[PDB]
Amino acid sequence: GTSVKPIFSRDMNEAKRRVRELYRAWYREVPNTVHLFQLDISVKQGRDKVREMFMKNAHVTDPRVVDLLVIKGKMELEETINVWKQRTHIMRFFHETEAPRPTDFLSKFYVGHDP
Amino acid sequence: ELVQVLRRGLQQVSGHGGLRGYLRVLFRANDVRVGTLVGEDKYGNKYYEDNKQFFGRHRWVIYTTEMNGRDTFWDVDGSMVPPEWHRWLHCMTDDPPTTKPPTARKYIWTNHKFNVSGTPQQYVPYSTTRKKIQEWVPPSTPYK
Amino acid sequence: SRGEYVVAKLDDLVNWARRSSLWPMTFGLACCAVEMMHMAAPRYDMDRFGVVFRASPRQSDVMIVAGTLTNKMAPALRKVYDQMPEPRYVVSMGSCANGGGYYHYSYSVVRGCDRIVPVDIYVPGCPPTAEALLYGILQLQRKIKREKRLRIWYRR
Amino acid sequence: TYKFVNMREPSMDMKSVTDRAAQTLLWTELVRGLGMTLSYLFREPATINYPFEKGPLSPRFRGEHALRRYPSGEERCIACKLCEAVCPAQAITIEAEPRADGSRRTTRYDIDMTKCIYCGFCQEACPVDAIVEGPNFEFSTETHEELLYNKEKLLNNGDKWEAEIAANIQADYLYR
Amino acid sequence: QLIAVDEKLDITTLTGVPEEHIKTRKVRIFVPARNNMQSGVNNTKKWKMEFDTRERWENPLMG
Amino acid sequence: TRPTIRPRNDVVHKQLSAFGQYVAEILPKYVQQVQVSCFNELEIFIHPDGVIPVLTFLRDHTNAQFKSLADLTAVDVPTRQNRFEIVYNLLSLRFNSRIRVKTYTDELTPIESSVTVYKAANWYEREIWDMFGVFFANHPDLRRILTDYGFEGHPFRKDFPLSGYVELRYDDEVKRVVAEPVELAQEFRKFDLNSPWEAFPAYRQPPE
Amino acid sequence: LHHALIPHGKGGRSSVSGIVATVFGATGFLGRYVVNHLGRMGSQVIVPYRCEPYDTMHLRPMGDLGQIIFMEWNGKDKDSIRKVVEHSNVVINLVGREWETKNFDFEDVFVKIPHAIAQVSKEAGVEKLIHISHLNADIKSPSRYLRSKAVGEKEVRAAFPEATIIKPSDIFGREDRFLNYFASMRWFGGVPLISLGKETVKQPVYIVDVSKGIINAIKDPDAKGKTFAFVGPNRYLLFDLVQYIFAVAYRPFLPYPLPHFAYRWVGRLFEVSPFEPWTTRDKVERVHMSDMTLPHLPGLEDLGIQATPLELKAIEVLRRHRTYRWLTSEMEDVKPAKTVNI
Amino acid sequence: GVRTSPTGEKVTHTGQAYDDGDYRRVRFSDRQKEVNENFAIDLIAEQPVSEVGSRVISCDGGGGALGHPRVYINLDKETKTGTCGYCGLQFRQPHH
Ligand SMILES: CCCCCCCCCCCCCCCCC[C@@H](O)O[C@H](CO[C@H](O)CCCCCCCCCCCCCCC)COP(=O)(O)OCC[N+](C)(C)C
Ligand SMILES: CCCCCCCC/C=C\CCCCCCCC(=O)O[C@H](COC(=O)CCCCCCC/C=C/CCCCCCCC)COP(=O)(O)OCCN
Ligand SMILES: NC(=O)C1=CN([C@@H]2O[C@H](COP(=O)(O)OP(=O)(O)OC[C@H]3O[C@@H](n4cnc5c(N)ncnc54)[C@H](OP(=O)(O)O)[C@@H]3O)[C@@H](O)[C@H]2O)C=CC1
Ligand SMILES: C=C(C)[C@H]1Cc2c(ccc3c2O[C@@H]2COc4cc(OC)c(OC)cc4[C@@H]2C3=O)O1
Ligand code: SF4
Ligand code: SF4
Ligand code: SF4
Ligand SMILES: [Zn+2]
């Protein structure tokens, strides 16, 4: 029951199919992105980052949430392909000027009060 | 006629105190008009009017060549005008400070300062409040 | 020394030419640009100081940031700043450009354009009047007068 | 109640046709435009000789902020914080404590001039005419830090501009 | 058409909040206490959600 | 009651009430509520499934003729199970009138795009999607319109913080503009202004 | 720690790191990166400059409001050094010129100025001093640059016993002289190399690695009196290095041997330029001298830095040196050069 | 009522002067420190106490609408003087 209306997919199988299609499109786009934006990363780095972004949301079990995630990923792909994005936008995925924040207890205790 | 305009030009060069004063005003303000001296400044600026000029060109100041410490023969700016002549010059009032002096207070600056930005006299912001948390001072004597 | 006198005179001549011929990029972001227009209008007539607008960043000496700089716009401002040949100057005009102003606490506003580019003159106001912007421009001219590149080079 | 801006029909008579042919071939309206520009060439320009000549202003003009005093030299501000509450840009920062003589006075009074929108709401809100927007507008700085005003800077502005500020207030307070 | 989703509602991956501000945060859900300086009770009618207090420090300039 | 109080207009109030009754009778399938505000504004609260029929009726009916879409927006009310309130404002030139149509949705439920009914909606629906995250089905080209490229989250939502989560600055080492977690030199100061004494008795709620 | 100097915040732009640093030589290649890394964390940075203030403009956006303070200084004046190090707990020295000017020889910039800085900062109570010398610093080296570096290193150690001395080797970066210098040679036609560059081994180090190493050495309590050597992860023969540089830039590589005396004569001819020389005799000596191996000194991995290989950062320096035809070529297309490691 | 700290820095009306070990003093080197020289506490301490022949006096700071809100000061205590909470002026009844 729970009486919900879908966006595109009726169960997780169709949602997974759409996820795979979007992943294929991003995988094909990465080399062109590296060429056009004149990025100093490799194609391997770009595809690894695409996989990491996809795996960030691997725990989702709602087909509607997956449909919205695919819609957002398609929005980002359309944005990248048309060059609406600049090199700064593409490089924002890699956080190159962010100092690594530690995760163990002792370093956090040393730096400050935040957990 | 044209000849009367030329005569106006010659009386304009004659009216600035000779050829060298004419050249001084031309190279100092890029203007050679003659107006009635409304007044002078305690810093040397002179203030003139000419009510026959259109609104905007009917009041002007010939700045001093020597402000507080700096040479202002070429380097002048609008911040050198003191507040009373500032009120008259920007047409906030019709009455000059000579005929309508401002009210006297003992905390008002007796010496106007110009824009001191980019100069060792510039303003540097800082916190004006005192310390909030006081730390414990350990005793100066050994504990054993 | 004769060499020091020569470099001082050449320094003055170059400084004089640059201050006299300041070409700002035709570039406006928001409300402040309107007052910029009023600086070019008959009443003030910036052209009489040798100050003429030119659209191309390659033919520009000064960038006037006249308006809010949002996050979406910051890369473009940085890009057209980088395409200015040197020497180049930046005049920050208005509260928005100076520090964010009315939109300082926004998710989409850069809190001051000096985070993106180096700024020479900060013109306060919201908007600054055309007269205040003209005062800032003449202050930039005075600052250019004080530069001594040749004297510094000779001393090296 | 409306009028038409482009609903007029051209006359078809031979005289009208010949006049339009003369307009087309001999460029009469273009000479009209040339005449208009030539007319403007011989007018007096509306330019003013800045900085020698200034633009007109009003007693209500909003400029650089200043903190004022009573004629005794005592500060007017009592740290009610109404200016800090009303400020739409949150440009005012205030800290207060009892003075050594028990007076209610500020220990911190900052205005961030790069946050300020120069609306004048604070001088409306002030119940003792302590904070004002003075007449000055020529205070461009070379660094951002010079535009972060503390209490000393604002008290200095008041001391420097009191003569004109009081005369401006006298000319406008009956409209307030 | 209805698809009968069975799972608990979860929108974290769509909100765009960084994960640090999703996992390490604690919210308080409460009806605010009446201000003891006054007798009006109109500020004690609705429920409030507010986050835990984090570090505040002093700006080196201007304090 | 004369000089400082806004005057009333009962004729327009009656006309709008009658027309609201008219609309409700014609479309019982979707119309849930009809209201006439005290300053003579007519609002029709409908079911989401009736977005396209209702508007179409209101655009094409001879007695309606609201051929112009003045505005379309969303309001976020977190306490409601359906978070978002979709508001259409329509103007009729033939009858010199205005109408408001309201519906509701939540985060995961699409609304039918009304570009077919009104061409003006395109950018309005894009803006609602960008600011609130409400998806519109069968939209010709749905993408962000106001926010920066790659911006995560929806700013107009009540939960989103006023200054957001990231800021921008130019970094010389990478020679480009970078996005970093927001740090503020001065925190926005939250004011508590609400008076503890009730202002308007006419709106008092039952004590539950 | 003097409560005002207690670290606060999340280590960002508006935070307080507890560092107050005076960076001599901040208007150079390494100085901009050092000031950027200091201002990222919210440090108070004092920049002494003798150049035209225009030339410091690029350092203005590196800090928050009030976090970067610019002050005029004179290298021959010790009252000026006192003025600029009075309130700092860290002093970093990056002063150095590749060529010798009329008013400053190598011994002035590498012995007198570093010693004066060390003496005055020790007198003023500065807690930490970081000095930069070269990896190849030596008392009897053929280059007077390196002889002066070694003498100044000893002088600094004598004037500030707890100073951290860092010895990098051929920093490469966008503004780096080293990658650019080889790139510059293409205009002439042929690349002149002594012995065809088959008798020289280089171990270049990335600029960001050196800046991070300096920053970490500041925050390291046990790096006080230590001496570090900052070197890259790979060693190359000069011939292979220049060939790789020309392959990344997509320029035709035409190397030819040039005898030592001819190259010295060319350097002397280029030395008479009143402006920045294209090359000098000292530069010719330093280019064709193999990088030393100092396994007994702590390295970047002792400061927590993983050295960046040149293969990963060469394109960001050399894409500017390409023509329009090859401007969009990817990074992994150039077949990394041959390393002579052990 | 200006006075310098042992470091040579002027002390403001607020009383804040940077401590000897405070690095922030570096912001004033090669520049100056803004200090307002007219101390209000000292200037109000010079005004003469006004003697009035009534138990309750009124103060509005002078200037009518240009002063402060009008307040009424009780003058029954003879061990002290009535002080305006807005302007700082002092009032007393003729005593002894
Ligand atoms: C054969 C020739 C080859 C070379 C040709 C080059 C062109 C010849 C040089 C022409 C020079 C003319 C420019 C100098 C004019 C100066 C104008 C003067 O008014 O400037 C004053 C100051 O003068 C400058 O400080 C010095 C200018 C000249 C310096 C020396 C010039 C020496 C020229 C030598 C030529 C060498 C050529 C080398 C290449 C062969 C200050 O004015 P300023 O403050 O702005 O005014 C502001 C506006 N106000 C006044 C209304 C407020
Ligand atoms: C007995 C036998 C004699 C032989 C015959 C002699 C008599 C000839 C009579 C006709 C002569 C006419 C000559 C003019 C040629 C051009 C006329 C023309 O038709 O051009 C216009 C357009 O020409 C222009 O108006 C030019 C536009 C740009 C104007 C720029 C500045 C205007 C000129 C300023 C003054 C010119 C001064 C010139 C003389 C300088 C001295 C050397 C047509 O364009 P439209 O109006 O759009 O209509 C056509 C399509 N429907
Ligand atoms: N490959 C490399 O880059 C290596 C560098 N090093 C050392 O690291 C340090 C940084 O090098 P790098 O950034 O490349 O050097 P740069 O030439 O880029 O910059 C040197 C800085 O020192 C200043 N300076 C030079 N001479 C004087 C002087 N006589 N008086 C005052 N200031 C002066 C310069 O100021 P101004 O802007 O006024 O000229 C400049 O800011 C140097 O000491 C260098 O010897 C060591 C090993 C390798
Ligand atoms: C060139 C002259 C004589 C005037 C006109 C002018 C400027 C400077 C800048 C601009 C400009 O006009 C263009 C076109 O019209 C607007 C209208 C704008 O808003 C009304 C606006 O705000 C950013 C910007 C612009 C352009 C703009 O940047 O000086
Ligand atoms: S500073 Fe004021 S006038 Fe200028 S762009 Fe911003 S809001 Fe508009
Ligand atoms: S003028 Fe307006 S923005 Fe500025 S301080 Fe006053 S109230 Fe705030
Ligand atoms: S300036 Fe006026 S409004 Fe602001 S705190 Fe002082 S008395 Fe109150
Ligand atoms: Zn009083």
Domain CATH code at residue D164: 3.30.70.3270
Q: Is C113 marked as a binding-site residue?
A: no
Domain around H63: 41-92
Decide: D27 in ligand 2 pocket, CB within 6 A. yes
- Cβ atoms < 10 Å from Cβ of G324: 6
Q: Residues near G176 by Cβ (< 8 Å), separated by ≥ 6?
A: G29, G207, G317
Give me the number of domains chain G comprises: 1
**Looking at the complex, does the CB of residue B122 fall below 8 Å from at least one CB of chain G?**
no
SS3 state at H91? strand
The span from the CA of F17 to the CA of F36, in Å, is: 6
The span from the CA of F131 to the CA of F115, in Å, is: 19
E39 C-alpha vs ligand 2 centroid, how far in Å? Answer: 89
**Looking at the complex, does the CB of residue B143 fall below 8 Å from at least one CB of chain H?**
no
Could you tell me whether strands C121-123 and C89-93 are parallel, antiparallel, or unpaired per DSSP bridges? parallel
D125 C-alpha vs ligand 8 centroid, how far in Å? Answer: 19
- Chain-centroid distance, C-alpha A77: 10
Where are chain C's structural domains? 2-155
User: What distances in angstroms separate CA G287 from CA G95, G99, G209, G237, one per listed residue?
Assistant: 20, 14, 21, 12
- Selected for mutation to probe chain F from E12, E13, E17 (highest F CB count within 10 Å) is E17
Q: At what angle do helices A12-36 and A63-81 cross, to 10 degrees?
A: 20
> What is the distance in angstroms between the Cα of G260 and the nearest Cα belonging to chain A?
38
Decide: B122 in ligand 1 pocket, CB within 6 A. no
- Chain-centroid distance, C-alpha G205: 10
User: Measured between CB atoms, which of D76, D104, D153 is closest to H34?
Assistant: D153
G94 C-alpha vs ligand 3 centroid, how far in Å? Answer: 6
Structure tokens of G228?
A: 């570090």
CATH of C2-155, one of 3.40.50.12280, 3.40.50.150, 3.40.50.300, 3.10.180.10: 3.40.50.12280
Chains near B (3 or more Cβ pairs under 8 Å): C, D, E, G, H
- Closest ligand 4 atom number to CA of residue C41: 3
The span from the CA of G216 to the CA of B19, in Å, is: 70
Amino acid at B12: Q
Phi-psi region of G206 (alpha: psi -120 to 50; beta: other; left: phi over 0): beta
User: What distances in angstroms separate CA A61 from CA A21, D34, H70, one per listed residue?
Assistant: 18, 75, 70
Structure tokens of G168?
A: 């990098």
Find the angle CA(C64)-CA(C69)-CA(C74) to the nearest 5 degrees.
95
The span from the CA of G54 to the CA of C147, in Å, is: 8
CATH at H47: 2.60.260.40
- Ligand with an atom nearest the CA of residue G136: 3
Q: Residues near D61 by Cβ (< 8 Å), separated by ≥ 6?
A: B92, D133, D135, D137, D168
The span from the CA of G245 to the CA of G251, in Å, is: 9
Q: Is D11 marked as a binding-site residue?
A: no
- Cβ atoms < 10 Å from Cβ of A98: 14
Beta strands in chain D (DSSP E): 65-67, 92-98, 104-112, 131-133, 148-149
Q: Are G159 and G118 in contact (CB under 8 A)?
A: yes
User: Measured between CB atoms, which of C135, C143, C146 is closest to B78?
Assistant: C135
Structure tokens of H55?
A: 């138990």
The span from the CA of D81 to the CA of D65, in Å, is: 16
> What is the distance in angstroms between the Cα of C16 and the nearest Cα belonging to chain B?
12
The span from the CA of G167 to the CA of G172, in Å, is: 14
Q: Smallest Cα–Cα separation from B87: which of B68, B62, B127, B59? A: B59
Q: Residues near A112 by Cβ (< 8 Å), separated by ≥ 6?
A: E55, G7, G8, G9, G10
Domain around G152: 1-342
Ligand 2 pocket check: which of D26, D27, D30, D31 to mutate, most ligand atoms within 8 Å of Cβ?
A: D27
Q: Smallest Cα–Cα separation from C113: which of C52, C1, C27, C55? A: C27
Q: Smallest Cα–Cα separation from C64: which of C96, C17, C105, C103? A: C96
SS3 state at G278? coil
- Please, do chains B and F touch (3+ CB pairs < 8 Å)? no
Instruction: Give the chain G residue whose CA is nearest to the CA of E54.
Output: G9
D73:B106 CB<8 A: yes
Q: Are C46 and C9 in contact (CB under 8 A)?
A: no
The span from the CA of G24 to the CA of G46, in Å, is: 9
Solved with = cryo-EM
Burial class from Cβ neighbours inside 10 Å (0-12, 13-18, 19+) for residue H39 reads: middle
C44 C-alpha vs ligand 4 centroid, how far in Å? Answer: 16
Q: CA torsion G8→G9→G13→G18, rounded to 10°?
A: 10
The span from the CA of G155 to the CA of G165, in Å, is: 12
Structure tokens of C143?
A: 């600052």
Q: What is the experimental resolution, given in Å to one decimal place? A: 2.6
Q: Which helix (H) or strand (E) holds D165?
A: helix D151-172
Domain around D141: 65-175
The span from the CA of F3 to the CA of C6, in Å, is: 80
